[PDB]
């Protein structure tokens, strides 16, 4: 009889940077997933391994709601089997991903005359992330053969970089808010359900 807090996720005032993506575990509640798939406000709604039209008949042990902002051209990177700086260095989904990637344009909320530079991504990393791994390290990345010793310089780059979200950006460079819903059924009571589950 407890309603799942999906509204907190989708209707948050500000979203996370992608390198510091947000995660909320959701269980012990009932959810009306139609509020999501009956909507016209989403630009993309790519589900993998499960039909959203059949979620209202199903129970799971956990639903994970990750959320963050990327630029438009990078929205396609939020999917299994993708290669790029977002999938490799910021947010990575497993090959057997089971959930939905729901994204919408947020240029009116996250861009600004003069530019909003408060959204960041990781540009450099020594290796690719594991699925659902987060990295908020700020060590100096050694790009060449010379050690850095924690000071910026030649071939020694700060690993985080800002999106420059101005309202006049092309749509590929405009901010998009992204929610990722993951569904998992462990050897435990399945407590997050649709109304008919």
């Amino acid at each position, epitope marked *: 009889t407890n309603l799942c807090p999906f509204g907190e996720v989708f209707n948050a005032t*500000t979203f*996370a*940077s992608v390198y*510091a*993506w*947000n*995660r*909320k*575990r959701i269980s012990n509640c009932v959810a009306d997933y139609s509020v999501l798939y009956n909507s016209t406000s989403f630009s993309t709604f790519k589900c993998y391994g499960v039909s959203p039209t059949k979620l209202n008949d199903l129970c799971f042990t956990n639903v994970y709601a990750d959320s963050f902002v990327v630029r438009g051209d990078e929205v396609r990177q939020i999917a299994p089997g993708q290669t790029g700086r977002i999938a490799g260095y910021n947010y990575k989904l497993p090959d057997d991903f089971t959930g939905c990637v729901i994204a919408w344009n947020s240029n009116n909320l996250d861009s600004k005359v003069g530019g909003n*530079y*408060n*959204y*960041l991504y990781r540009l450099f990393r020594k290796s690719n992330l*594991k699925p*659902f*791994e*987060r*990295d*908020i*390290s*700020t060590e100096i990345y050694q790009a060449g053969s010379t050690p850095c010793n*924690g000071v910026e310089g030649f071939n020694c780059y*700060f690993p*985080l970089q*800002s999106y420059g979200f101005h309202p006049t950006n092309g749509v590929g460079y405009q901010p998009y808010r992204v929610v990722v819903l993951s569904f998992e059924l462990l050897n435990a009571p399945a407590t997050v359900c649709g109304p008919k589950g």
Partner: antibody
Amino acid sequence: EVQLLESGGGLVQPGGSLRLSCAASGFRISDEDMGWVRQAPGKGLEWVSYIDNAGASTYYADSVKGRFTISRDNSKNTLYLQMNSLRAEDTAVYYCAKSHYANPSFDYWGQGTLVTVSS
Amino acid sequence: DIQMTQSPSSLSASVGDRVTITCRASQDIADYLNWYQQKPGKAPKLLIYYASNLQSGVPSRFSGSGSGTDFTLTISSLQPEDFATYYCQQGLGMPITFGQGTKVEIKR
């Protein structure tokens, strides 16, 4: 309401070890980020260790790297800091704290527990 | 590390005055700046998260502003209970670093 109750501090020999615990209630210990921050007597706040709510990634300050280990017990809903090879400079009030965001922002703190390293 | 420098280190101010404490970061930390208050013998308490957002249970007398490398905490009407040490802390990434604190004493 969220609560963090610490225990395990006390007097320990130089080079000895000690495990601090932080029993949480009002939330699940692994749903939100958790960390340890310490304060030597009359000094500032020094972040010590951290563990996230994603892939359980852990972080440590250089001053404690190789000697401290942060962990959680989900069945006990408790956070732990295992401290080995303690020095006098480790004498401090140790606090556990919760961060509701992946960018570290400590919104709930334990009462603190005093760790004294001396002969 | 991202060094945090607060200004001033201490200050005296009478009841009802407006107190302004600044915090500078050696690097751009965008809006990932937090303000804590710590009173004698107690754990720090979060006052401001994300440069300008007020935590639940904290009065609107406290407010925060700034972005990039420069930040400001403001107490609009200083009360006797506000005697404390106030810390800033960047949340851009690891390692977490605090400012050295600003000791606020009430002038009487």
